[PDB]
Amino acid sequence: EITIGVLSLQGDFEPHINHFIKLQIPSLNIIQVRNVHDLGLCDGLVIPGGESTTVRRCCAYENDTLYNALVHFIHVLKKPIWGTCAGCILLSKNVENIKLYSNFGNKFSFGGLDITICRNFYGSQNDSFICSLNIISDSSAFKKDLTAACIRAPYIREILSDEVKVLATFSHESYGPNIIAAVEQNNCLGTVFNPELLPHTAFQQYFYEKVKNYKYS
């Protein structure tokens, strides 16, 4: 039995949840995670897309109870975590950078990915695009020229460690070549796109395998 949780205090999950169910893997259970009890049942965790200045705030209740548990889950237990859009930002070392939005900000990130990241630098919400990507992995999932849902996404400006593996990149005709779309660092996976908004389930499958391996450890 493999249990993957999806942080649900807000963001777009019943998709992420749906998209993992699309895998149709008998051993796999998905749950909502809204508290420390739920988190304790998880073999791996997805921190989905949505606001962050929201997702973080949700974790701030009862004197940062959930926040602290998540930090422990990521850095002490070294359990697999997949931070997508907003979640990717919340795994990042540097977040770019909280002019007013700063409140307890230094503690703002959960950490886990040694990168510098830029809160959606792309115009607004009526410009968000889509993509096809490239992949530097041998995993069976990743197949032909895949697709993405880069929607008002964040920008990975810096890689800060050799430990960080650039998992996927893409080339756009308005953002330059070799834009970093996916990174992996130990027990952390980070994506700037929306995996739940395209029909294929490649990144869900990949993260599932990560969680599966984590156990057999």
Partner: protein, 282 residues
């Protein structure tokens, strides 16, 4: 520009991001900041009027774009604006300003008494209001990417919102029951398109994101809407006319994120202060 390629599949995709969120109505930068601070996934910008002007019946129009630009550069959460019903030029103007979402709103003065905006002609997604399923589906037919209840705007009274939620909820589960033959006459009764009725049937719910709006004044109100199956909540006067906007704003967000947990709902309702006075004059 326009949708119904798969920029749609794109608009829908974008709106899903809002699920579980609270969008807040703001009149100035101070209010925007309070909203961002409280965990709001977005703010909706309103005309800034004094109480004395409120008496009069002035024509309510879309806001000056400069006032939107001013507020947007002091926050990083989503930014929404309102246009008058059927006023497609106000929409064209805000589209060019790169706003995140438009609300074709019945709270502003109607610009066209027969026709709504043809919303497919825009890349910016629209939200529209409804009080029942036919109305909701007609708005989606016209190109809305998101729906909200109308409720009773500005009264602090939840009753209408609740009614509208239940009306749509029932018609949907019922529609889902009928036989293939009966669906046609029902379509004619709702004065709605058979295609979207069949799609609602196949999805077992409303085919777009669906928020509660109008009259939400306590955390309890908010959670109640969520427990009835809504995807989220718009709040306005309930926050900024309360005794403690900041604390009220934060508690409403917490409640929406934890709407099934009575212990948290209790906890975030303690020592909240006075809620908006409100008005029970139908």
């Amino acid at each position: 520009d326009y949708a119904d390629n798969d920029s749609i599949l794109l608009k829908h995709g974008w709106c899903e991001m809002l699920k579980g969120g609270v969008i807040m109505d703001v009149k100035n930068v101070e209010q925007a900041k309070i909203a961002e601070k409280a965990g709001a996934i977005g703010v909706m910008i309103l005309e800034n009027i004094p109480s004395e002007l409120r008496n009069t019946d002035g024509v309510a129009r879309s806001v000056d774009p400069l006032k939107i630009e001013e507020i947007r550069k002091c926050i990083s959460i989503n930014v929404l604006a309102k246009v008058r019903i059927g006023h497609f030029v106000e929409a064209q103007i805000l589209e060019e300003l790169k706003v995140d979402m438009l609300d074709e709103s019945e709270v502003l003065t109607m610009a066209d008494e027969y026709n709504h905006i043809n919303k497919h002609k825009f890349k910016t997604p629209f939200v529209c209001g409804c009080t029942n399923l036919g109305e909701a589906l007609r708005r989606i037919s016209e190109g809305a990417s998101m729906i909200r209840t109308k409720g009773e705007a500005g009264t602090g009274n939840i009753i209408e919102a609740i009614k509208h939620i239940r009306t749509v909820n029932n018609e949907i589960k019922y529609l889902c029951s009928l036989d293939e033959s009966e669906v046609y006459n029902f379509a004619k009764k709702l004065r709605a398109p058979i295609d979207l009725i069949l799609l609602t049937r196949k999805l077992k719910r409303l085919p777009v994101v669906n928020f509660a709006a109008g009259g939400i004044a306590t955390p309890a109100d908010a959670a109640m809407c969520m427990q009835l199956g809504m995807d989220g909540v718009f709040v306005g006067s309930g926050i900024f006319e309360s005794e403690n906007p900041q604390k009220m704003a934060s508690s409403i967000v917490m409640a929406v994120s934890n709407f099934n947990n009575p212990k948290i709902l209790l906890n975030v309702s303690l020592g909240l202060g006075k809620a908006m006075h409100g008005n029970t004059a139908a």
